[PDB]
Write a protein that binds this ligand. Structure first.
Ligand code: TZD
Ligand code: TZD
Ligand code: TZD
Ligand code: CA
Ligand code: CA
Ligand code: CA
Ligand code: MG
Ligand code: MG
Ligand code: MG
Ligand code: MG
Ligand code: MG
Ligand code: MG
Ligand code: MG
Lengths: 525, 525, 525
């Protein structure tokens, strides 16, 4: 067998059947004789390729395979990799290298010092020392991406390797099963359970690895047993809990002082599947107030190491959540009372308040909708206004890198064909990965894109205000016609200048057979 | 003085007055109180920011200053940095970092292991250990980018540094002059000159560092004195010689065997300002044929080290070209005869042959036009069909990374307001950095964009053919409306479905007061 | 509190009370006011510092703290770090950096790009962005070194940081408990146990992480229950099993073909706490023969990923070994029969055969002796001839880097004051870290050093023979007087030119009150 044949067999035996890519000459010898059981999803720029694959991986809860062109293609994708690192997305990034005979002279398209290029944003990065090593290196890539804590990996392959003879002993790679589905030993788990059972006023904080593990239902059981309020850890990339469950208390503010104040009076705070904590704004104060102890369960040693407070347990989130939910006592305390519904913001017959948009989406979207957020000034209101009952219902750029949601929404929709995906994206954010629209059109992936158009980088204007920073350039983005951009890439386009038009456009979009972009005129800050 | 004030003073004293950027929160404390003598050029995605700055730097022959957002912004720009590395573009890339107090906990927007992120695509990469060090670090960045061999550099700055007190001793940085304008010592230069004078059949090969140095006119004098044919080194990122000068022999094929065959019979081959050589296709054979010796003058030790043949001299291209041109004897050999004009390709009343497009551009464009190429299957014909008399008349992505020409054409046009810039870009290539169009519209930079629309990644289809590679996915890009994309970003749009319409559209574009995009229907391969 | 005070409090609260070091100016502000409850162990060169700390950490099964001088000191230790990486040794390596004000100018003693220096041999490498971050960074270092898979970490600290005010919120670091004591979930563990119970002819292979975890006794129980032969994985850095237990089958040959042949006929092979496998010699063949399946339990994702065959489980070795030993059925198969005693090699009244030396050590050493091996041509015989009943009884350089055993033997002896440490070191190997002898003398650490003097790099001569490699230089090391070297560093020295003298010297050494070096005249290969 050839390295080509052996590698595709390894991929299929390990459950991979889709290649997300933008092709180049170094990759043609890999892509030739493309297997009939695989599918190739083309995107027009590499940030889009990786964003689509990322959404697909996160929603499918399995690794996604990417093929990029040498250094330039890899480089174009590095902002996308920054998000993938923070979301623990299992991405296998392969890039084609020049033929071994032309690497030394640094021919055009040579990826120089290739393994260093994507660092520090990958778990593992490698170029094999010979063609026959390629399948083994691919095996390593698959498992490194997939083991807890999951994350992106990078493999560079000289294009002449594919046609070479494979090592017959590579067959031992095909069916390897590698598990990191582990939890705390019985003795220490019993100690943890007793601490939870004995708490007088416990609180629970959940992060994105709960949703990645599909541990959501177990966390609901845990919260109900402990009669504990549940918060989502700050800067949330996913939604780990039903947002109308009585225990739910919403998104934590991303500040040190704000969080310790929120947790004051809670004697034991159990954090599951989150960094402690992904703070954002400068908000100095106490990490915890006296009387509060924190216990963190994380899948990531790097998270456990850097927490400024609390104990930590490094283990699989799915296994730990299931064990805790089934071991803790049913507290006799009263179940927390559900948060009240948000207020209806006054809305005239003109430009839309973001609150109106979210209320209307919540009214009209199916109960199993999936939302993506890249409307940076409206996140708090989005979290308060969308009832998300099911797992896998929310995604937001985990490293704060814009250009995620538009392509990721396409990948999520590909992963979940029966769940309507609705991406709510600011006019500023929409541009970073605008060409991803073409992939939705070409493959008829019926994502709905809602563009919140207020003509400005609103979150930055707001921050400039808090800094009292005057004379900051580059904050306004006037003069973009999103319906024309959608037309450019073959996506049906609608406009909504007021509430009547928003409802009409959403009704049309929800009944459409393909992707739809709605440009919404929103109020300026 | 503050670090902010001192740093802007350093920048202005070192000749920097423009910031190319896409802003973020970590950069707001740098951008606040933006000096009234500086200008800020916003682009909507970071590949576009860096591409614009790159074109500006290359055309202006001076460093360009860039400001990006943390890791995600830097990452989005890394494909652009790959081109900049290969073109020796003097780019100062700054990125904002989290406040020092929040780096340890890895707050959102922390650029982790920041200096490693852009490696290996930068000459120098650094984060200062204290606020007061920032001006000195910026000084280092300026000089590292600017010294031969020029290239991109990276500086990460915690956002809280800007408001801190500067070291008064930083004033010594302001007026530092650093020179690498050096040439071979007299004794060894005399030896080189004698070898050139004694050659029976010399040839000259020129690369992009000749154009960067504005050594073009000196190379013309050198070629005339030696009565030598002149080739442009393969994979050419710039044009270093007047293309209708009698000595000009065109672009070298990017193959080992092809080049040694071309050089056969030439006893001394002098290469100036190029790698030896930027080969591309697999074309094995002899590096040089018996009877040919090669001497390379390069500004880059890395180039001198990796040449598989020949002697090398590492020195400034401007200084060396001037010295050689003025020292060599006037040979009594006959001056080479000019290459004949290219053939006129048969053209019916339908879709345009690329040859027709280039002939028409050559007919209608001003004699001081500047062209950018990102029409990958048509490069050879472009080189044969455009009369480029002046320096700085051609740019092509130096690392082969698409997404360069569209934004770079805007930067070049900003650098050269009196020279009409015409970017000839394939339909595939146009998408990588499509949002750059907005910057041309917003700042009214009157670049003309000619989109060669043949519906496919033509160069890849061609290569698949030579590989006899069947069943390669992802080679077709149907269904893009470039006039709608132009409308989306505020750029006047025209179509040309035939020659009559092409001439009409070019006439309109050449007389327009702003940027114009022409979508040309070209023949499919 | 100062950063100095806070950092020492953190160290003591996390169980650290010893600093292994070689001091320099950048470290004096850390070492001043050295706490009276800490001890400082000086060694004369940094390879020795790290080797001593490594032995101490491995034997104590807890992290060891190291303090080195800037780049040169760190660099001198990097061979030692290569061993520490392979042995999963929890080492906290700190190095002093120049004062922040002098880093920019690259004053003498500046550690440039410090965090990159020890890569790729550390789990985590870092320089803090401010003085107040130092305690948090130290906390991260402690936990990163200590979490599974354990390993070395690196922290660079500007010397001016120590006197600065600490953040009062650093107190939350002091008592953090971080656990990776995890095992496979119940459902999947039950599946594993059933596979073991159902095996017709199981085999067990154990690696160094078993001894590190003190899982030895649990593995004995497991082997007895399964009635399974037990091998030590190749290139063994530690001894994980009693070497005279009836199940013990010795050290596996470090070859692919040799191992698959050894395992032929075994239907299930359970590997615990080893890479699969640390092969060494070129010995191509099948990874496993038909009929053999392999299951690996490893603490290291990197090991699980790179195994060329078998299933893997990534978990804590102590927790897994205990669970398996207590869950498996008692097989009704016959317990394996003990290996026969090794043959007595003929020995005349002249130079010593290595076999004679090991037999004599086994005869005379206490039953709880600890051996270190750096006698590279005699390893197989050592493994056959020493009865090691207890855990922590054997160490060998895990990355094959010589210079480990001499200093490590001092660290082990410091960790285990009631167990006589005997280091058996070749004349070649003895030189790499010879100055470590001084530390044993100065602190009166009563290690016994047995120098096997055959005048040559015997293992290399042997390998040259198998390569049929003629005319290899540099294989002989005549003219070293080890008794004089011992005298040089203050260690009692004895010679043994024959068996009578060996017995006499060992008797004297075993009764001595301080360290002793015995130079043994061994047979030449
Ligand atoms: C790749 C990248 N570049 C720049 C930024 C910085 N950025 C700016 C550019 C965002 C403003 C987004 O504007 P929007 O129109 O999408 O939404 P709002 O008007 O609601 O803020 S928020 C802020 O994080 C970023 N996060 N990512
Ligand atoms: C960033 C990036 N991605 C992928 C490629 C590989 N690429 C492909 C995508 C190009 C085809 C360009 O298509 P085009 O429409 O712009 O021009 P032609 O049809 O004349 O080839 S040429 C080839 O180098 C690349 N060079 N750079
Ligand atoms: C730091 C280092 N340098 C060189 C070597 C290579 N080396 C050579 C130098 C060793 C020979 C050791 O000689 P010895 O006297 O200690 O023992 P033998 O005579 O029994 O081989 S074995 C072999 O691995 C090494 N392992 N480590
Ligand atoms: Ca906006
Ligand atoms: Ca095309
Ligand atoms: Ca020896
Ligand atoms: Mg990098
Ligand atoms: Mg247990
Ligand atoms: Mg699916
Ligand atoms: Mg001179
Ligand atoms: Mg100008
Ligand atoms: Mg369980
Ligand atoms: Mg002890």
């Amino acid at each position: 067998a050839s390295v080509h044949g052996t590698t595709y067999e390894l991929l299929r035996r390990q459950g991979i059947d889709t290649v997300f890519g933008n092709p180049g000459s170094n990759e043609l010898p890999f892509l030739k004789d493309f297997p009939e059981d695989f599918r190739y999803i083309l995107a027009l720029q590499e940030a889009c390729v990786v964003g689509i694959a990322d959404g697909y991986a996160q929603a499918s809860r399995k690794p996604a395979f990417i093929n990029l062109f040498s250094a330039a293609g890899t480089g174009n994708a590095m902002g996308a990799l920054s998000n993938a690192w923070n979301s623990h997305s299992p991405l296998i990034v392969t890039a084609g290298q020049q033929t071994r005979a032309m690497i030394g002279v640094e021919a055009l398209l040579t990826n120089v010092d290739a393994a260093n290029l994507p660092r520090p944003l990958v778990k593992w990065s490698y170029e094999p020392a010979s063609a026959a090593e390629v399948p083994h290196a691919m095996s390593r890539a698959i498992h490194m991406a997939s083991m807890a804590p999951q994350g992106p990996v990078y493999l560079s392959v000289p294009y002449d390797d594919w046609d070479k003879d494979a090592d017959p002993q590579s067959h031992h790679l095909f069916d390897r099963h590698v598990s990191s589905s582990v939890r705390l030993n019985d003795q220490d788990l019993d100690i943890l359970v007793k601490a939870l059972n004995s708490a007088s006023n416990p609180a629970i904080v959940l992060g994105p690895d709960v949703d990645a593990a599909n541990a959501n239902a177990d966390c609901v059981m845990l919260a109900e047993r402990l009669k504990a309020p549940v918060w989502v850890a700050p800067s949330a990339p996913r939604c780990p809990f039903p947002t109308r469950h009585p225990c739910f208390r919403g998104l934590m503010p991303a500040g040190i002082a704000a969080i310790s104040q929120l947790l004051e009076g809670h004697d034991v705070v159990l954090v599951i599947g989150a960094p402690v904590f992904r703070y954002h704004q400068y908000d100095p104060g106490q990490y915890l107030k006296p009387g509060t102890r924190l216990i963190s369960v994380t899948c990531d040693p790097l998270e456990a190491a850097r927490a400024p407070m609390g104990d930590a347990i490094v283990a699989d989130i799915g296994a730990m959540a299931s064990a805790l939910a089934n071991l803790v006592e049913e507290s006799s305390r009263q179940l927390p009372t559900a948060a009240p519904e948000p207020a209806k913001v006054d809305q005239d017959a003109g430009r839309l308040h973001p609150e109106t948009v979210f209320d209307t989406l919540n009214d009209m979207a199916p109960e199993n909708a999936i939302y993506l957020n890249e409307s940076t000034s409206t996140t708090a209101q989005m979290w308060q206004r969308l009832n998300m009952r099911n797992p896998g219902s929310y995604y937001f750029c985990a490293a704060g890198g814009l250009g995620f949601a538009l392509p990721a929404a396409i990948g999520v929709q590909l992963a979940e064909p029966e769940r309507q995906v609705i991406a709510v994206i600011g006019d500023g954010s929409a541009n970073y990965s605008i060409s991803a629209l073409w992939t939705a059109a070409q493959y008829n992936i019926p994502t709905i894109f809602v563009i919140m158009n207020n003509g400005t980088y609103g979150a930055l204007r707001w921050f400039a205000g808090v800094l009292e920073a005057e004379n900051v350039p580059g904050l306004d983005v006037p003069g973009i016609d999103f319906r024309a951009l959608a037309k450019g890439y073959g996506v049906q386009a609608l406009k909504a200048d007021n509430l009547e038009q928003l409802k009409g456009s959403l009704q049309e979009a929800l009944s459409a057979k393909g992707p739809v972009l709605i440009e919404v005129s929103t109020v300026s800050p």
